[PDB]
Amino acid sequence: KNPKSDKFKVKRFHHIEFWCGDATNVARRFSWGLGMRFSAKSDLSTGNMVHASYLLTSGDLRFLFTAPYSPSLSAGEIKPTTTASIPSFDHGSCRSFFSSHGLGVRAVAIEVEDAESAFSISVANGAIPSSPPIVLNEAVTIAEVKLYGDVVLRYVSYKAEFLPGFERVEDASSFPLDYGIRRLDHAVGNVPELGPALTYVAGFTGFHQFAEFESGLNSAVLASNDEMVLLPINEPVHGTKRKSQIQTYLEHNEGAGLQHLALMSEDIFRTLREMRKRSSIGGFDFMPSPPPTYYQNLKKRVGDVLSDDQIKECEELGILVDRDDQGTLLQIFTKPLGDRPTIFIEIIQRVGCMMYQSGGCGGFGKGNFSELFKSIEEYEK
Amino acid sequence: KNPKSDKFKVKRFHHIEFWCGDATNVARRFSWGLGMRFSAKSDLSTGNMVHASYLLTSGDLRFLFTAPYSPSLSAGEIKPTTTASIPSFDHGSCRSFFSSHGLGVRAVAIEVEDAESAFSISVANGAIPSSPPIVLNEAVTIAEVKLYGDVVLRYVSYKAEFLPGFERVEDASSFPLDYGIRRLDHAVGNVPELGPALTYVAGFTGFHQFAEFESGLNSAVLASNDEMVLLPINEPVHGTKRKSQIQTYLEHNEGAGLQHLALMSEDIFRTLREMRKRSSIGGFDFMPSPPPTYYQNLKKRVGDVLSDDQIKECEELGILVDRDDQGTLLQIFTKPLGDRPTIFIEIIQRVGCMMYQSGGCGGFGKGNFSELFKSIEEYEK
Ligand SMILES: O=C1CCCC(O)=C1C(=O)c1nc(Cl)c(Cl)c(NCc2ccc(Cl)cc2)c1Cl
Ligand SMILES: O=C1CCCC(O)=C1C(=O)c1nc(Cl)c(Cl)c(NCc2ccc(Cl)cc2)c1Cl
Ligand SMILES: [Co+2]
Numbered sequence: 001k002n003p004k005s006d007k008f009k010v011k012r013f014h015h016i017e018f019w020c021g022d023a024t025n026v027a028r029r030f031s032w033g034l035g036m037r038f039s040a041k042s043d044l045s046t047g048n049m050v051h052a053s054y055l056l057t058s059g060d061l062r063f064l065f066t067a068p069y070s071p072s073l074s075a076g077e078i079k080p081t082t083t084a085s086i087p088s089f090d091h092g093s094c095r096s097f098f099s100s101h102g103l104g105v106r107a108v109a110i111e112v113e114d115a116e117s118a119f120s121i122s123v124a125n126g127a128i129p130s131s132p133p134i135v136l137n138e139a140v141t142i143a144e145v146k147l148y149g150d151v152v153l154r155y156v157s158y159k160a161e162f163l164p165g166f167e168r169v170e171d172a173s174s175f176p177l178d179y180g181i182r183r184l185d186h187a188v189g190n191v192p193e194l195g196p197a198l199t200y201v202a203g204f205t206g207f208h209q210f211a212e213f214e215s216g217l218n219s220a221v222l223a224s225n226d227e228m229v230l231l232p233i234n235e236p237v238h239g240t241k242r243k244s245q246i247q248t249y250l251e252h253n254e255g256a257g258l259q260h261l262a263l264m265s266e267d268i269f270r271t272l273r274e275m276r277k278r279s280s281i282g283g284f285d286f287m288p289s290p291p292p293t294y295y296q297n298l299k300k301r302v303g304d305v306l307s308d309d310q311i312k313e314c315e316e317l318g319i320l321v322d323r324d325d326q327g328t329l330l331q332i333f334t335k336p337l338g339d340r341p342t343i344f345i346e347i348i349q350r351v352g353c354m355m356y357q358s359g360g361c362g363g364f365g366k367g368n369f370s371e372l373f374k375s376i377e378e379y380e381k
Numbered sequence: 382k383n384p385k386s387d388k389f390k391v392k393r394f395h396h397i398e399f400w401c402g403d404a405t406n407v408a409r410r411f412s413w414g415l416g417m418r419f420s421a422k423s424d425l426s427t428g429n430m431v432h433a434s435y436l437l438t439s440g441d442l443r444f445l446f447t448a449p450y451s452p453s454l455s456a457g458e459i460k461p462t463t464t465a466s467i468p469s470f471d472h473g474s475c476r477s478f479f480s481s482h483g484l485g486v487r488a489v490a491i492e493v494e495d496a497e498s499a500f501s502i503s504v505a506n507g508a509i510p511s512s513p514p515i516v517l518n519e520a521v522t523i524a525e526v527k528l529y530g531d532v533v534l535r536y537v538s539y540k541a542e543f544l545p546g547f548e549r550v551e552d553a554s555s556f557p558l559d560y561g562i563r564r565l566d567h568a569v570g571n572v573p574e575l576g577p578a579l580t581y582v583a584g585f586t587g588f589h590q591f592a593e594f595e596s597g598l599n600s601a602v603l604a605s606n607d608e609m610v611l612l613p614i615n616e617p618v619h620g621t622k623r624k625s626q627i628q629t630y631l632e633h634n635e636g637a638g639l640q641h642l643a644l645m646s647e648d649i650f651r652t653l654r655e656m657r658k659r660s661s662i663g664g665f666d667f668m669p670s671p672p673p674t675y676y677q678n679l680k681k682r683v684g685d686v687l688s689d690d691q692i693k694e695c696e697e698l699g700i701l702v703d704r705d706d707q708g709t710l711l712q713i714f715t716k717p718l719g720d721r722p723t724i725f726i727e728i729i730q731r732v733g734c735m736m737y738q739s740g741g742c743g744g745f746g747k748g749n750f751s752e753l754f755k756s757i758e759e760y761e762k
């Protein structure tokens with residue numbers, strides 16, 4: 001059931017912003033590891049004395065990496081005279097965030113019709129304001145409200161190229177890497193208590209619960225009207241034999257925050273071949289593959305969607321497969337992106353639900369919790 | 382003149398330690414950019430609840446990348462019960478260093494006969510103590526004194542594998558990259574005042590001035606007995622037309638610190654081909670090449686050391702060449718390693734002074750200051 005209750009007009013995911021200690025090194029690592037091109041910058045070379053910000057793009061996916069300079073470079077500025085291109089940025093907030101949480105997502109940014117209206121309606125409906133609407137060069141409006149922990153939901157609206165004051169990167173510095181990633185599918189938060197987190201976010205957005213369908217967690221998914229903005233949230237389940245990985249996250253992250261970004265690929269086999277080639281030469285590692293038990297049982301579950309060749313190809317690459325009543329989900333998880341066992345990435349591809357493809361086709365992998373387990377009965381095999 | 386006045390027995394450079402916000406992303410970037418292998422780790426997976434530390438090696442060169450975890454993970458420990466593998470590490474010092482200076486070198490580590498003696502003799506001769514000698518698993522002794530700014534000179538001595546509590550990285554995670562880099566040749570500091578810095582360091586080490594031979598700086602080089610540990614120091618020259626790049630460093634770094642690491646290659650042409658291939662796909666950028674004027678004048682200066690083919694090969698790769706009275710220096714500089722215009726890397730190869738090659742053969746490039754200038758008379762050509 002989709003009541004289409006959005007309290008303001010939401011379009012799509014726009015960008016994800018990581019707060020870093022050194023934006024250059026994280027951005028270069030991510031560019032090589034994920035096959036994203038350097039597309040825009042805002043830094044000393046563009047007159048920004050406040051923060052260094054580098055944008056990576058792959059298809060529609062935009063990753064922004066930002067770090068503070070010495071405050072001394074901008075100590076004479078005030079907000080009316082700032083050279084920062086992102087006016088919500090604050091040196092102290094960014095250093096506090098990074099020392100508390102380590103490398104991670106500060107902003108989940110969605111494009112909206114009118115960022116000033118979205119902010120006003122959000123706060124009127126319970127959103128905790130984080131940064132008020134500011135109009136950038138009479139062209140772009142940006143506003144921020146708290147989402148969970150120290151993560152903000154960022155509204156961006158365009159009258160009519162990333163943000164004013166960002167410069168397009170020169171082609172010599174912009175190598176056209178591409179491993180097939182095309183857009184952000186969903187962004188997932190970990191919280192101590194799911195109920196209060198859902199009531200808060202659904203309260204100020206009007207996002208509705210996206211329907212799903214005893215290891216670690218309870219979750220629920222909030223969705224915009226066309227279900228293209230998807231925001232799952234997890235809480236830990238305590239008292240289990242194996243300690244909840246949500247609780248481990250909360251401990252190492254110093255509380256709630258963004259757990260994973262799921263990135264849609266136009267060809268998950270090519271994406272995984274390319275990413276795995278680079279795992280040990282600067283890119284990303286992947287979680288341990290499920291046993292061949294798992295793939296020996298995939299024929300009985302998705303043998304009508306994937307050929308015998310394509311399922312064995314899944315086993316080469318360690319890809320997981322799940323199915324709901326509308327479509328099929330191919331998915332795989334990286335190891336944590338940084339020092340702490342906190343944020344990681346999911347690569348996904350969805351098949352089915354063609355009308356364009358409707359959002360969330362195939363779900364989020366809930367059936368794989370039982371199936372992985374089942375599959376680990378190989379120790380008795 | 383080499384008075385061989387070392388106040389304690391010094392062997393060679395041992396490692397360089399970077400203090401980072403996220404050690405994983407810097408280490409992976411550096412590994413790919415410089416062709417260094419992941420060789421050892423100390424982190425949560427090895428029981429270290431305090432800091433994440435990753436070691437990269439190429440030949441004899443050792444780069445260590447360290448970042449703090451949340452203090453909460455280790456809040457119950459005391460120094461007698463610490464799980465840190467580097468006992469000098471302190472969360473507050475590391476966060477303070479990184480917020481002040483950005484990504485950069487915290488420790489220049491040299492191997493000595495007896496780290497406890499080196500510490501005691503150093504401090505008896507004016508060294509400011511930073512971390513007292515500590516014996517690690519009755520096998521390794523480590524001690525630290527202040528060098529300049531917040532950089533420490535670290536003494537390491539071995540009774541008889543990097544440090545106790547570090548684990549060798551599994552071969553699957555350890556790809557054998559190698560672009561030809563083999564050892565640290567010299568490590569250079571920038572200070573506001575050269576005189577007091579030299580008197581201090583030469584005062585507690587007994588290092589002697591290594592002989593050299595109006596753009597930016599004055600410098601001098603301190604050297605151990607066999608001149609294999611080489612520590613140049615620069616100060617700005619004020620009142621010039623072009624602002625001193627040493628002063629720019631001091632401003633962006635929030636004071637004195639390490640300016641560059643010079644890494645010896647066994648084949649600088651191969652190293653530069655390999656590094657430049659990767660500049661735009663996650664590796665390192667290089668400073669702008671000198672004009673073809675410069676290479677059109679290299680035949681008259683080093684045409685007896687490099688063939689016409691090898692000099693044109695220098696012009697392809699942007700390599701600089703200098704010569705003193707003992708040998709020839711091939712050198713090239715990266716752009717800054719991180720967000721701030723502070724630390725960068727030099728790649729070098731030295732030819733001559735064979736007896737083994739004596740240290741500092743060919744100097745440090747002082748003649749290239751005049752020659753670059755001269756060469757930029759092409760705007761009138
Ligand atoms: O869990 C949910 C519920 C909310 C919706 C959502 O999108 C997801 C997933 O995407 C998902 N689904 C599956 Cl089936 C598994 Cl097994 C997952 N975690 C494995 C994993 C654990 C730790 C590390 Cl460090 C890396 C990987 C994840 Cl995170
Ligand atoms: O200067 C000294 C004197 C002390 C001994 C020493 O080892 C060096 C050099 O190695 C050196 N020699 C030369 Cl000839 C040049 Cl032009 C240099 N700087 C260019 C450069 C400037 C800014 C950035 Cl960001 C990158 C590069 C350097 Cl740093
Ligand atoms: Co997911």
Ligand SMILES: [Co+2]
Pocket residue numbers: 567569641643727745
């Ligand atoms: Co040098």
